[PDB]
Amino acid sequence: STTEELAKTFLETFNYEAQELSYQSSVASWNYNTNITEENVQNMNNAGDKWSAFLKEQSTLAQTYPLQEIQNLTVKLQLQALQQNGSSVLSEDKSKRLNTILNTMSTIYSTGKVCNPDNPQECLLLEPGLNEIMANSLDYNERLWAWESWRSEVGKQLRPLYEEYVVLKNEMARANHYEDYGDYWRGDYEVNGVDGYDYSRGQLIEDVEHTFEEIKPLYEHLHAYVRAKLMNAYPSYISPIGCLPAHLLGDMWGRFWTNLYSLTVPFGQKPNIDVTDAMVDQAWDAQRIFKEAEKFFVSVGLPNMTQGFWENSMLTDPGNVQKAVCHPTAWDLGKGDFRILMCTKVTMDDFLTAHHEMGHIQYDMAYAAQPFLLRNGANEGFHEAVGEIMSLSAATPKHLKSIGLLSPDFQEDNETEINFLLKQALTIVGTLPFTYMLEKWRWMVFKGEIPKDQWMKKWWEMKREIVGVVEPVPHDETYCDPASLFHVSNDYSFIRYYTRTLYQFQFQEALCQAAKHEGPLHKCDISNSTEAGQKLFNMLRLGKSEPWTLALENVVGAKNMNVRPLLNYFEPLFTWLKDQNKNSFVGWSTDWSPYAD
Amino acid sequence: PFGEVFNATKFPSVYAWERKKISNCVADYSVLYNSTFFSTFKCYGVSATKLNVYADSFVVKGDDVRQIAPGQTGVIADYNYKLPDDFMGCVLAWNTRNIDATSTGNYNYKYRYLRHGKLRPFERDISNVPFSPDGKPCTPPAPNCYWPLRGYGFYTTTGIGYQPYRVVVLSFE
Ligand SMILES: [Cl-]
Ligand SMILES: [Zn+2]
Numbered sequence: 160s161t162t163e164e165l166a167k168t169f170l171e172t173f174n175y176e177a178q179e180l181s182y183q184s185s186v187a188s189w190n191y192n193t194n195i196t197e198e199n200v201q202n203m204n205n206a207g208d209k210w211s212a213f214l215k216e217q218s219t220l221a222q223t224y225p226l227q228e229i230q231n232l233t234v235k236l237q238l239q240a241l242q243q244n245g246s247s248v249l250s251e252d253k254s255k256r257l258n259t260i261l262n263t264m265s266t267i268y269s270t271g272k273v274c275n276p277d278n279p280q281e282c283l284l285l286e287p288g289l290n291e292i293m294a295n296s297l298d299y300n301e302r303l304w305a306w307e308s309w310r311s312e313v314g315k316q317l318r319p320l321y322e323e324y325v326v327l328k329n330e331m332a333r334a335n336h337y338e339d340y341g342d343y344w345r346g347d348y349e350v351n352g353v354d355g356y357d358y359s360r361g362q363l364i365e366d367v368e369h370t371f372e373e374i375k376p377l378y379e380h381l382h383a384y385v386r387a388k389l390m391n392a393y394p395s396y397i398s399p400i401g402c403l404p405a406h407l408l409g410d411m412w413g414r415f416w417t418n419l420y421s422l423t424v425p426f427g428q429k430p431n432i433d434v435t436d437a438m439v440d441q442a443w444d445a446q447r448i449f450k451e452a453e454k455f456f457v458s459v460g461l462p463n464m465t466q467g468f469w470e471n472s473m474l475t476d477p478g479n480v481q482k483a484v485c486h487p488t489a490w491d492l493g494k495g496d497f498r499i500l501m502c503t504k505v506t507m508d509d510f511l512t513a514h515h516e517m518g519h520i521q522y523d524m525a526y527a528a529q530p531f532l533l534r535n536g537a538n539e540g541f542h543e544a545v546g547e548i549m550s551l552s553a554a555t556p557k558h559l560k561s562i563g564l565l566s567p568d569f570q571e572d573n574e575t576e577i578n579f580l581l582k583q584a585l586t587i588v589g590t591l592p593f594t595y596m597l598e599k600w601r602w603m604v605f606k607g608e609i610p611k612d613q614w615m616k617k618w619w620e621m622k623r624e625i626v627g628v629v630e631p632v633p634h635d636e637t638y639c640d641p642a643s644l645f646h647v648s649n650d651y652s653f654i655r656y657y658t659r660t661l662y663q664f665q666f667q668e669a670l671c672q673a674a675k676h677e678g679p680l681h682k683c684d685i686s687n688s689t690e691a692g693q694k695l696f697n698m699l700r701l702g703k704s705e706p707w708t709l710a711l712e713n714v715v716g717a718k719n720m721n722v723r724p725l726l727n728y729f730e731p732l733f734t735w736l737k738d739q740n741k742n743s744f745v746g747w748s749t750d751w752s753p754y755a756d
Numbered sequence: 757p758f759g760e761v762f763n764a765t766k767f768p769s770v771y772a773w774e775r776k777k778i779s780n781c782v783a784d785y786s787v788l789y790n791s792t793f794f795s796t797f798k799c800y801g802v803s804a805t806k807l808n809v810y811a812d813s814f815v816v817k818g819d820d821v822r823q824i825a826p827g828q829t830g831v832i833a834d835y836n837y838k839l840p841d842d843f844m845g846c847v848l849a850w851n852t853r854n855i856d857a858t859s860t861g862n863y864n865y866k867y868r869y870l871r872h873g874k875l876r877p878f879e880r881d882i883s884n885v886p887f888s889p890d891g892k893p894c895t896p897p898a899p900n901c902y903w904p905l906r907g908y909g910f911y912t913t914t915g916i917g918y919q920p921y922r923v924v925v926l927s928f929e
Contacts, residue, residue, distance in 0.1 A: 160890035165900055168870070168889050172902050175869065179909055183861070186911070223899055471913055495818075495915020 162228040169224065170237050173217055174531045178493055181531075184210035185492035192484045193473050193500060218243050232352065233704070237532045248334045249327070257327050260320050264648045271313035273305075285309065285411070293411040294418040299393050303631050306406035310640050317648055318639035322611060329605060341605035344652045347538055350706035356718065358708060364602070367654070370661065370722040371595050377729060378592055380736045381584045382627055383745040385416065388423040400744045401751030402629040405622075409585075412644050413628055416589035420582050425735075429575045432556060434564035435506045441564070445474040445503040448510055451562065452517045455553065459685060459692030461521055468498055468520070476502035487512050489519030489546075491534070497523060510564075511550045518549040526702030537698070537707035539652055540659030545699070547663045548670070551683075558684040573731075580681065580732045587660060588729060594657045596625035600641055601653070612636050620749075627747040632754055661722050665715040668724040669694065680727045757781045758788075761813045767856070767922050770836045771868040771905065772882050773814035782807050793850055795921065796821055800844035801928065810845075810927035812837075815856060815865050817908060818917040821849050824925060833875070835868045837925075840877035845928040849921045853912055856920035863907030865920065870904040 187206035190199045221241040229235035246254045273289070274282035283289050292305040328340040337343045337360075345360040382403070390397045393407060409418030416423075449472075453464050477483050485502040487509075492498070499516050503509055522545045526534050536542030552558055559565035600618060603609050609617045615634045618641050622628050634640065642648040671680060674688035685691050697713035708718045715721075726733070757778045768774040785805050788794075816824070816832060823832040824847045826839050833839070839847070856862060870887040886894025887904045894901035910920040 164889055168900070168902070171869065175906055179861075179863075182911070182914075186913070465915055467913065467915060494911065495917040496911075496913060497915075 162224065163230060163234065166224045166229070166234055166238055167231075169221070170234065170530070170532075173241065177213065177217075177531055180206075180210045180213050182492060182494050182496070185490070189490065189492065189500075192488075193477070195482045195484070214243070215245060215247070217241055218245060219247060233530075233533075236703075237530060240532050244335055246331060249331060253327055253330070257324075260324050260327075261650060264317055264320055264324070264642070267313055267316055268645065268648045271309075271316070273308040273312050290411055293406070294409060297392065299396050299407075302406040306411070307632055309411065310634070310638050310643050314638045314640055314643045317642050318637065321639050321642050321648070325604065332605075339605040339607070341602045344654070347652065348658075348707065350708060353706055353709070356706045356708045358706065363654075366719060367595065367657065370720060371592075373722050373726065374588075374591060377584075377588060377726060377733050379627075379745050380733065380740055381581075381588055382747070383740045383743050384736050385419060385423045385585075386747075387743050389419075392422045396753065398748075398751045400746070400748050402623055402627045402747045402749070404631050404753045405628050406631050408589075408628070413593055413626070414590055414644070416585040417582075420585055423581070423585070425577050425581055426574050429578050432554070432559070432575065432579055433507050434510070434559055435508075437564045437566075438505045438507070438510065443505050445505075448503060448505070448513045449474060449499070449517065451510075452514045452549075452553075455514060455549070455686060456517065456521050458687045458689075459695070460689035461692060461696070462524065464517070464520065465495070465497055467496060471496070472498040473500050474503050476504075487516055489516050489523070491520075491523040493531075493534075495527060511553050514549040514553045515546040518546040521545075522699055525696060525699035526704070528700065529702035529704050533702040533704045535703045537701065537703060537705070537710035538658070539655040540662050541698075541707065541710070543655070544659045544663035544666060547659075548666050548685075551663070551667055551681075552685050555682060555684045557682065558686055561684070561686065577732065577735055580729070583681075584729060584732060587725075591657065591660060592626045593628075594653060596621050597641070597644075597647075598654045598657070599625070601647065604641075615640065623747075623749040629751070629753055633752075658720060661720045661725055662711070664724040664728055665711070665717070665721060666695075666698075668727060669715040679731050680724075681731075758783055758811070761811050761924055764813070767813055767815045769864070769866040770814045770816050770832065771866055771880075773812050773837055773880065776811045776813070778809045778811060788848070794848055795851055796847060796849035798825060799846040800826060801846065808928070810925075810929070812925045812927070813923065815852075815908075815920055815922045816867070818851075818915070818919045818921055820867075821921055821923070824849075824923055830874070831869060832867065835871045835875060835881070838875040838877050838879060839925065843877075843927075846926045848924045848926065851916070851919055852922055853910070853919045856922070857910035857912040857914075859912050861909045861911050862920075863909035865908045865910070866905045867908065868904050869906060870902050 183206045187199075187203040191203040218241055221238055224238055226235055226238055226242070229238065246257060249257070268285070272282045272284045274280075283291075289305045289309055292301060296302045296305070325340070332338070332340045332343040335343070337346065342360050345363050348358055348363045349360045350356055350358040386397065386403060387399070389403065389407060390399065393404075396404065396407075403413075405413055409416050449464075457463060473483070476485065483502070484500075487501040488499065490498045490500060497520050499513075499520060501509070501513065501516065503513070519542060522536065522542060523534070536545065556565055556569065556571050560567050560569065600609070600621060603617075604614070614636055615638060619630050619634070622630075645651075646653045667683065668680060670685045670688075670691045671683035673694050674683070674685045674691035676683045694714055698710045701710050701713070711720070712718055761776050814837065816836075820832045822828065823830055824837065824839060826841050826844060830836075830838070856865065868881060871881065872887075872891070875881065884903070884905055886896055886898075887902050888894045888900050896903070908920070910918070
C-alpha cells in the first residue's frame with residue numbers, strides 16, 4: 160500500500176468505468192450523427208453529459224496522488240492525463256464567463272452572415288456563399304468584398320472577446336506552471352525522463368523555426384511562380400516584386416492555395432489521374448471501395464476490418480426518411496467496436512478518402528492493447544499523418560493500374576507529373592508558412608510580446624514577412640482577423656497542421672526505402688509490401704505509450720521532425736521552378752501594398 | 757443429463773459461477789463432438805470416450821475466454837475462476853450476443869477485479885465488501901474504496917472480443 164500501489168488500483172477502476180461511459184457516449188453520438196431526430200439528439204447529451212461528469216469527478220479526484228512518486232513511468236503518464244485540471248483552478252465566475260465567451264465566438268462565427276451592401280435584402284453565410292466566392296470568383300472586387308465583409312462584421316465583433324479570451328486563458332496556464340497558454344499547447348510535444356528521447360516545451364519552437372528554414376527556398380520559389388501566374392489572372396493588381404493580396408489566394412484566408420490550380424497549372428494540356436469515370440464505368444459500389452481498401456492494408460500484413468465493422472458502419476447516404484451528417488469520419492467507439500461514417504459516392508476523391516479513413520481505423524486497432532488512456536496517436540499530428548500516408552500511396556498511377564481503374568496501357572509522362580506535383584505544392588507547401596506565422600502570432604501574443612493596439616500591425620507585419628502576403632485594405636485594431644478563422648475563434652492547437660505535414664513524409668520515406676523504392680519518392684506505393692508494414696506497426700501499436708520521438712524512430716529511424724524528406728517529395732518540382740523563375744524575381748518586398756498610401 | 761447446463765435458459769456470472777455434479781449417468785459426448793456452434797474446445801486431458809464428473813458454467817467477455825486454461829495470469833483467473841496447473845479435462849464456449857446482449861447494454865453479468873490474494877484452483881468467492889489495498893474496511897464514497905464487483909454490459913454491437921460468451925468447464929476425476 161505505497162503511493163503508487165494506490166494509484167495502480169485507481170487507474171484500474173477508472174479504466175473499466177471509463178470504458179462503459181465512453182462507449183455509451185459514442186453510441187449516442189453515433190445514433191445522432193446517423194439519424195438526427197429529437198429522441199436521438201436529446202439522448203446524445205444525456206450520455207455525453209454523464210461522460211462529461213465522470214471526468215471532472217475523476218480528474219479532481221486523481222489529485223489524491225502526487226505524480227512525483229511514480230516508478231512504473233506509464234502510471235505517471237496516465238495519471239498525468241487525468242490531471243486535466245480543466246478550467247477549475249479559476250473562479251466559478253471566470254470559468255463561467257470564459258465558457259460564455261468561447262460559446263459566443265463559436266456561434267458568431269457559425270451564425271455571422273453578411274448582407275449585400277448593393278442588395279440589403281440578400282445575404283450569405285461563410286459556408287456556402289462567401290466561401291463559394293473566395294474559391295471561384297475572378298472579380299478582384301467581389302473577392303475583395305467578401306474578404307473584407309467577413310473580417311469587418313464578425314471580425315470586429317470577435318475583437319473584444321478575444322482580448323479577454325487571452326487573459327483568462329493565460330491565467331489558467333500560469334497556475335499549472337506553464338509560461339503562458341502558449342507554453343500550454345506546446346506541452347503536447349513534451350517528454351520527461353527516458354534518455355535521448357526527452358523534449359522540452361520550447362524546443363518545438365526551435366526545431367520548428369529551424370526546419371522551417373530549409374523550406375524557405377522551396378517556398379519563396381513556389382510563391383514567385385504562382386505570383387507571376389496570378390499577375391495574369393488579375394492584371395495590374397499585383398507587383399512583380401511585391402507580396403500576394405490575401406483575397407486572391409484560393410480561399411477565405413489563404414489557408415490553402417489549392418483552388419489556385421485553376422490558374423497556375425503548368426500545362427493545361429494534360430488530363431486524368433482521375434479514375435472517377437473508370438469506377439462508375441465498372442459499376443463499382445460503396446462496398447467495392449471500402450472492401451478494396453481493406454485489401455491494401457492486408458497487402459502490407461495488417462488485419463481485415465472487423466466482422467462488426469461491416470455490420471454497423473454506414474457507407475452510403477441513408478437518403479430521406481432518415482437525415483444524417485455526412486462528414487466522412489473514423490470511429491473508435493472502444494469495446495473493440497470500430498466503424499466509419501461516410502455518405503460514399505463512387506468518385507476518386509471518395510476512393511482515396513475511404514483509404515485515408517480506413518487508415519485511422521487501422522491505427523486505432525494497432526493501439527487497442529494499450530490502456531484506455533494511451534489509445535491515441537503519439538500526438539495530435541500522428542493520427543492525421545498516418546491517414547494521409549495512405550492517400551499518398553493509393554493516388555499513384557502505379558497503384559491505380561495495379562487495381563484496374565487505370566487502363567494498363569496508360570503511361571505517365573513527366574509533365575502530367577509536374578502538374579500533380581505542383582497541385583501538391585498548392586496545398587501541402589502553401590499552408591506550411593501560413594501555419595507557421597499563424598501559431599507564431601498567437602504564440603507571441605500569449606508571451607505578451609504583442610500589445611493590444613498593434614495586434615494587426617503585428618499580424619500583417621509577419622504575414623508580409625513569413626507568408627509574403629498583403630492586406631487589400633488596411634485594418635486597425637477594430638478588426639481581429641487572426642481569429643476570423645475557425646481554428647482560432649474556436650480555440651485550437653493549429654501547429655498540428657504543420658508537424659503532421661513533416662511526419663507524414665519521413666513516414667512516407669521510411670516506408671519507401673524499406674519497401675525498396677526505385678523511382679522518385681512520390682511514385683511510391685507501399686502496397687503489397689509487408690516488410691515495410693511491420694516497420695509501421697511498431698510506431699502504430701504504441702498509441703501514446705512512448706514518447707512520440709521513440710514512436711517516430713520506430714519507422715523513420717530518427718528522433719526528430721526533419722523536413723529533408725518533404726523537400727525530397729518536392730525535388731522534381733523544386734528545380735523545375737528555379738527554371739521558370741530564371742527571369743522572375745524570387746522573393747518579395749515587405750513594403751509594397753495593394754491599397755497604396 | 758448435460759442438457760441442463762448447456763442449452764440451459766439462464767447462466768451464472770463468473771465470480772459467482774455454478775458447479776454442477778453429474779453422478780451415475782451416461783452421455784455419448786457426441787452431442788459435443790459435433791456442432792461447430794462452440795468457439796472453443798481445448799481439452800487438456802484427451803478427446804475420446806469410455807462411458808464413465810464436474811461441469812461449471814458461467815459467462816465471460818470474449819478475450820476473457822483465453823483465461824479459462826492452466827497457467828495464464830488472469831484478472832479473471834486471479835480473481836474469479838482458476839483452473840489447476842495440472843489436473844484437467846475440457847473448456848468450452850459459444851457466442852451469445854443475441855441472448856445475453858441488448859442494444860442498450862445488459863450489465864447483469866458481473867466479475868471481480870479487486871481482491872487480496874489469488875484464487876487457488878477451483879476456488880470461489882461471493883464476497884461483496886468494499887475493497888482497499890491494505891485491509892482498511894471501506895465505506896464509499898471514501899478515498900480508495902471500491903466495490904470489488906462490476907458489470908460487463910454486453911452491447912449487441914461490440915467487437916467479438918467484447919461479446920458475451922458462455923462457458924462450461926467439464927472436469928473429470
Ligand atoms: Cl488575416
Ligand atoms: Zn482524417
